[PDB]
Amino acid sequence: DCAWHLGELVWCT
Amino acid sequence: DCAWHLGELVWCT
Amino acid sequence: GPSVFLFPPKPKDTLMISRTPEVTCVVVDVSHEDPEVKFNWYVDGVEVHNAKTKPREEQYNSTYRVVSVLTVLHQDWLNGKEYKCKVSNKALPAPIEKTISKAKGQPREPQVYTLPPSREEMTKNQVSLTCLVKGFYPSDIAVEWESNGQPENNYDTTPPVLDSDGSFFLYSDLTVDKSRWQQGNVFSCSVMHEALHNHYTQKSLSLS
Amino acid sequence: GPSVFLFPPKPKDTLMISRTPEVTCVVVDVSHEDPEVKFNWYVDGVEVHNAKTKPREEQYNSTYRVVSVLTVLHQDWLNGKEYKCKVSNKALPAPIEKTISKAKGQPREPQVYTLPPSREEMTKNQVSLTCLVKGFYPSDIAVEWESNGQPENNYDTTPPVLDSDGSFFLYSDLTVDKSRWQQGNVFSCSVMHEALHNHYTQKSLSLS
C-alpha cells in the first residue's frame, strides 16, 4: 500500500 | 543604550 | 484520555522587554462527562497564582479543549527557571505534570550573513533575499525582515538545525517585487537572540 | 575569512520518494582575489563524485558566494549515513570540513490533535484551525495543510520544541475565510515523519 500527498507519491510498503 | 525593533523596545543596557 | 501540552513562550516575546511572554498549558480530549480541569502552576517548585483560565471550547467527539496561560517575567525565563503545569481531572488516574524551561548551556551569539539575488534570480519578477545564521545557542531565536522601518512579511525561515559542535543554524528567505529592489530600497534581516548585545542585530542588503 | 554552511535536505524531500533530497554546501565571503573553491564530498568517509557545482555569484565586499549541491538517496539519509563537504580555497590555512547526518536515536511517531475555532474565533471574518503535534523523534518533520486535494498555504508552524523526555512537539495554525468553513469544507493537517506508517498521516476537521 502507498501513501499519497496531494496526488504525489509519498511512500510504499 | 537601547535596541529598538520597528519602533518597539527590545532591550537596554 | 485527556492529553496535555505545555508550550514555551515565543522567543521574540522573551527577548523584547515591551512584550509579555507566556507559557501555555493546553488540555485536549477532555470528556463532556468529566469536564472540570484544575490547573496548578509552579515556578521552580514554588506555586504561583496569577495564571489566567480560559473558558472551555467544543472539540470533536463530545470533548472539550481547556487552556491556561501564565505570564512569565523575561529575566526569570532567561535565568533558567523551571515552569510546571499540573493538570487534574476526574478521569485521570493521577494528575499530569509538564515541565518547561529554557535550555541550559553557555549562550553563543549568532553570526549573520546576507545573500543578494543571483544573476538568474534577477530575471524573475520577484527576487529573493537570503539571510544565513549560524553559531547560536540556545536554539531559541527570532528572525524577521524589515525595510524603511516597516515590517516585511513575505519570508520563510527554517527551524534551527543542530550543528555538530552543539550550536544551531538556519536560513531565511524574503521575496520582494524586483521593482522595489531596483529602486534601491534597503532590506534587513533582524535577528533577536539572548546572546546578542541588547538581544538584537541587523544585516542589510540593497542593489549595488 | 571564507565561511561554510552545510544544510541538510528538507524533511519533506527525504520522506517523499518522488522528491529528490539534497545537501547544500554554501561558502560565503570568498574573496575576489582568491575566488576558486574546491569541493570534496564524502558519504560515510567514502568520496563521491556526482555533486553539482553552481557558478559563483556577487556578494557585498568584493566577495563571492559559491554553492555545491549533492543529491542523496532517501534510504541513505534515513539509515543515518554521514555526509561531508570539504571546502578548499587558497586563502584558507587548512581545508574546512562540515558534517551532517540525521539525528541518531529510536524513532518515535507523532501524535496529532486538531483544534476547531473557539466561540470568539467564529465572530471574525477569518477563522484559524490548529494542529497540535507531540511525541516525535527525530525532530525532522513536515506539516502542511490541505482541503479537497488542494494545497492550503495560509499557515504557520512552530519549530519543534524539545520535550523533557527527549521527543519533540509543535503546533500549526491555518487561517481560512469563515465562509469556506461555514460551507462545510473539510480541512486537514498532513504530517510527514519518518516513524509514521508510510511517513504520512492526516487529521481532519470541519464544521459540526
Concatenate the DSSP letters of all residues of chain C into one string. --EEEEEPPPHHHHH-TTS--EEEEEEEEEESSS---EEEEEETTEEE---EEPPPEE-TTSEEEEEEEEE--HHHHHTT--EEEEEE-TT-SS-EEEEE-PPPS--B--EEEEEPPPTTGGGSSEEEEEEEEEEEBSS--EEEEEETTEEE--EEEPPPEE-TTS-EEEEEEEEEEHHHHHHT--EEEEEE-TTSGGGEEEEEE---
Q: Which residues of B touch C198 (CB under 8 A)?
A: 1-3, 10-13
Cell of C42: 509552579
Do D120 and D182 share a domain, yes or no? yes
Residue of D nearest to A9 (CA): D18
d(CA C146, CA D150): 32
Cell of C45: 517548585
d(CA B6, CA D5): 29
Q: How far is CA D133 from the centre of its chain?
A: 16
Are D87 and D99 in contact, with CB atoms under 8 Å apart? no
Q: How far is CA A10 from the centre of its chain?
A: 4
Alpha helices in D20-95 (DSSP H): 74-78
For residue D166, with 0-12 CB atoms within 10 Å meaning exposed, 13-18 middle and 19 or more buried, which class applies? exposed
> How many Cα neighbours within 13 Å face the side chain of C79?
8
Range of the domain at C187: 102-207
The answer to whether D114 contacts C60, with C-beta atoms less than 8 Å apart, is yes
Q: Do D and B touch (≥3 CB pairs < 8 Å)?
A: no
The answer to whether C28 contacts D58, with C-beta atoms less than 8 Å apart, is no
D122 to each of C198, D75, D87, D117, how far by Cα in Å? Answer: 40, 45, 55, 6
Are C172 and C130 in contact, with CB atoms under 8 Å apart? yes
Domains: count for chain D = 2
Give the determination technique: X-ray
Angle, CA D147 vertex, CA D15 and CA D173 arms, to 5°: 75
Q: Could you tell me the sign of the dihedral formed by the alpha carbons of D109, A4, D160, C70, in that order?
A: negative
Q: Which residues of D touch A9 (CB under 8 A)?
A: 16-18
Cell of C27: 488540555
The answer to whether C15 contacts B10, with C-beta atoms less than 8 Å apart, is yes
Tell me, in Å, the resolution of the deposited structure: 2.5
Do D80 and D125 share a domain, yes or no? no
CA distance C197 to chain D (A): 22
Angle, CA D187 vertex, CA D186 and CA D188 arms, to 5°: 125
Do D15 and D43 share a domain, yes or no? yes
d(CA D160, CA D180): 29
Q: Collapsing DSSP states into helix, strand and coil, what is residue D202?
A: strand
Which of C67, C101, C135 lies at the terminal end of a domain, its last residue? C101
Do C87 and C123 share a domain, yes or no? no
Which of C85, C101, C117 lies at the terminal end of a domain, its last residue? C101
Provide φ and ψ at C90, rounded to 5°.
-60, -30
Cell of D139: 525532530
Q: Collapsing DSSP states into helix, strand and coil, what is residue D78?
A: helix
For residue C147, with 0-12 CB atoms within 10 Å meaning exposed, 13-18 middle and 19 or more buried, which class applies? middle
Cell of D143: 506539516
Cell of D171: 503546533
Do C95 and C47 share a domain, yes or no? yes
* A 1-13: CB under 8 A from D: 1-3, 5-13
- Is D153 an interface residue toward C (CB < 8 Å)? no
Chain D residues touching chain A at CB-CB below 8 Å: 15-18, 144, 146, 149-151, 190, 192, 197-200
Residue type, C57: E
Do D73 and D166 share a domain, yes or no? no
Are C35 and C29 in contact, with CB atoms under 8 Å apart? no
The answer to whether B7 contacts C199, with C-beta atoms less than 8 Å apart, is no
